[PDB]
Write a protein that binds this ligand. Sequence first.
Ligand SMILES: NC(=O)c1ccc[n+]([C@@H]2O[C@H](COP(=O)([O-])OP(=O)(O)OC[C@H]3O[C@@H](n4cnc5c(N)ncnc54)[C@H](O)[C@@H]3O)[C@@H](O)[C@H]2O)c1
Ligand SMILES: O=C(O)[C@]1(O)C[C@H](CP(=O)(O)O)[C@@H](O)[C@H](O)C1
Ligand SMILES: [Zn+2]
Length: 336
Amino acid sequence: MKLQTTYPSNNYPIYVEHGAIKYIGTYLNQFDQSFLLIDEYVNQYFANKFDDINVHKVIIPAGEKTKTFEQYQETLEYILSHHVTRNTAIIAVGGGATGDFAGFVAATLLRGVHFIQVPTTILAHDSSVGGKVGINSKQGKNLIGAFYRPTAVIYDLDFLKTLPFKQILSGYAEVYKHALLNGESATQDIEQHFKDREILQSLNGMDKYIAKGIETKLDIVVADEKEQGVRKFLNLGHTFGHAVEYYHKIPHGHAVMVGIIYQFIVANALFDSKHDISHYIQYLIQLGYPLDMMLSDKKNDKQGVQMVLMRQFGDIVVQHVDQLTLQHACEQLKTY
Ligand SMILES: NC(=O)c1ccc[n+]([C@@H]2O[C@H](COP(=O)([O-])OP(=O)(O)OC[C@H]3O[C@@H](n4cnc5c(N)ncnc54)[C@H](O)[C@@H]3O)[C@@H](O)[C@H]2O)c1
Ligand SMILES: O=C(O)[C@]1(O)C[C@H](CP(=O)(O)O)[C@@H](O)[C@H](O)C1
Ligand SMILES: [Zn+2]
């Protein structure tokens, strides 16, 4: 299984399969040099699997810790003291935090070097695609960054077999977000597969759902690349997610999910949609999600918050929302 971009020119591949880590050599030795940027923890996890392969490993901080200015500068400089060249490659081995970061590096190093994505998490089935590199600020989630099409995406599904539930739940939220953006057909289909923590935690049939969630996006991104129209949809529930996250430091997905319900709550308070909140709540409980726990966003336009609201499957929209509505929802949600 392989997917590829559809843009007019400068298109990259997305090898999605078990053992795709093999596809990596086929490029590597066609570069002057190559820097391996890898998660501190992830490096532990698979340090050996890479020995099997003009290559300098660069171990970076674990997760979100790596996405800071401080860390961007330090790295670059290091990578610079190697009299590098435009034909050099940056290889992101890890979660979206590793890619988002490394990529930014690869996007700026000498105005643009080669970028290779070796996503290792479930959530990375979204982060590895689109080329939305960038880092964090003291003002929020990724305010500094860029769009930089990766040279290619190597998604070796074997990486996943070692993900704590905490990270499985995190990532799935995206696989699920994508299902949601495919109308009912995919939503209630996926719901009927991963209907409980047991089945989920087992990773059984995740191959199927990830592959689609990606393709789903693959179409949106290949279309509205610079997020001018539809790419704005992918920000489903992040309006509230991105917030609750950077403000509760829970795993990305956890906040997304939450925000994803919030969105619905607000859909009802606006278009009086027939959203069965209680249904989505039991879904998160049955799935095993925790369940005990905004003015600066990217879709925002000077006037107030802009949310990606679903009025019904196959009918997503974006628009302002008075803090008024944002209350009853973030209060109706408090009744849980
Ligand atoms: N389009 C985009 O650029 C985009 C899309 C989605 C989300 N994101 C970004 O993605 C990040 C969230 O993704 P994430 O969950 O992958 O982040 P992450 O890098 O923090 O990974 C989660 C944790 O799991 C560890 N880990 C990674 N691979 C593992 C594996 N295979 N087995 C076990 N442990 C592993 C990491 O060390 C980390 O502690 C955020 O920084 C978010 O802003 C960006
Ligand atoms: O266009 C995308 O790929 C996203 O909207 C990009 C966002 C990141 P942003 O809102 O910081 O651009 C990501 O969290 C979301 O899951 C998908
Ligand atoms: Zn996200």
